[PDB]
């Protein structure tokens, strides 16, 4: 009954990450842009959200706030491009857990989302 929302503009990885948790007893919700993500956060109220920070059309750092203006309890893990140190800070300074720069080891994400979201 643990909800996870995947928010990347690339299907592949979105499908990938899914299948990953789609295994460890997690109900998974996908999404391709911020406008969709909210509605899901808003409607299905996820536990953890893995948010891609460089999606054309969205200021992840913006939907990050909104996402918290909707449920600050919200547990959000940002996926970033390596070297975006300011975005990471401002973000972790907004209320996030830990960034994960792509291409991240498929291992530690399930691991890390576990020690962050026991099921």
């Amino acid at each position: 009954n643990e909800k996870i929302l995947i928010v990347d503009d690339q299907s592949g990885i979105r499908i990938l990450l899914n299948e990953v948790f789609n295994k460890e007893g997690y109900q998974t919700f996908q999404a391709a842009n911020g406008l969709q993500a909210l509605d899901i956060v808003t409607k299905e109220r996820p536990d953890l959200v893995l948010l891609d920070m460089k999606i054309p059309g969205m200021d992840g750092i913006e939907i990050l706030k909104r996402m918290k203006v909707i449920d600050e309890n919200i547990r959000v893990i940002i996926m970033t491009a390596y070297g975006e140190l300011d975005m990471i800070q401002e973000s972790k300074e907004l209320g996030a857990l830990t960034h994960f720069a792509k291409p991240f080891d498929i291992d530690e994400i399930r691991d890390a989302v576990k020690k962050y979201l026991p099921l």
């Binding site: 990938l16 391709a32 054309p56 059309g57 792509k102 291409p103 991240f104 498929i106």
Partner: protein
């Protein structure tokens, strides 16, 4: 090679290209882990075909159009572009601006018609081997329209000396065939 602004610009674009490849290494190692070796191979080939088109486009002696397509997704748009070149490489330099301009016009009509919740994708195909026209342009879109009534002007009333051969638009798709001479 210089001008510090220009230099800062190339450094910046090469950074975008870098992320794209990292995403790809993400798809490669991701499946590489879930032991789906036949997909990895599958992807890689798709990769070699995208790279195969980028190249072609970079060889039509049409720099202003190539630069627009190669950078389009690195800018804050509400849809993603996928382009392909159908036919052998020709010297379409005599068409660079016309195309580049026409594409700009079609490009924003779209970014002012598409919904912003939908996952919008647009495929542009540049055919260099048509038997009757010197060049036809095909646009295949899938998504959602907020203001579909934006394509009105160009539907009845075309655009310049380009024969807009077909322009269909349904609930989530849009087909356009434009011919050039």
């Amino acid at each position: 090679i210089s001008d510090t602004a220009l230099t800062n610009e190339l450094i910046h674009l090469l950074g975008h290209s870098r992320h794209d490849w990292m995403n790809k290494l993400q798809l490669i190692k991701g499946n590489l882990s879930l032991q789906k070796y036949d997909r990895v191979f599958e992807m890689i080939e798709e990769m070699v075909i995208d790279a195969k088109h980028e190249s072609k486009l970079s060889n039509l002696k049409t720099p202003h159009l190539a630069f627009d397509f190669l950078t389009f997704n690195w800018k804050t748009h509400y849809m993603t572009l996928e382009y392909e070149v159908l036919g052998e490489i020709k010297d379409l330099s005599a068409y660079d601006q016309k195309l580049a301009k026409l594409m700009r016009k079609l490009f924003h009509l779209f970014d002012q018609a598409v919904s912003r919740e939908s996952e919008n994708h647009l495929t542009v195909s540049l055919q260099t081997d048509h038997p009757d026209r010197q060049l036809i342009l095909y646009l295949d879109f899938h998504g959602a329209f907020a203001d579909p009534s934006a394509f009105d002007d160009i539907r009845q009333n075309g655009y310049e000396d380009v024969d807009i051969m077909r322009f269909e638009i349904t609930s989530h798709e849009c087909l356009i065939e434009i011919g050039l001479d």
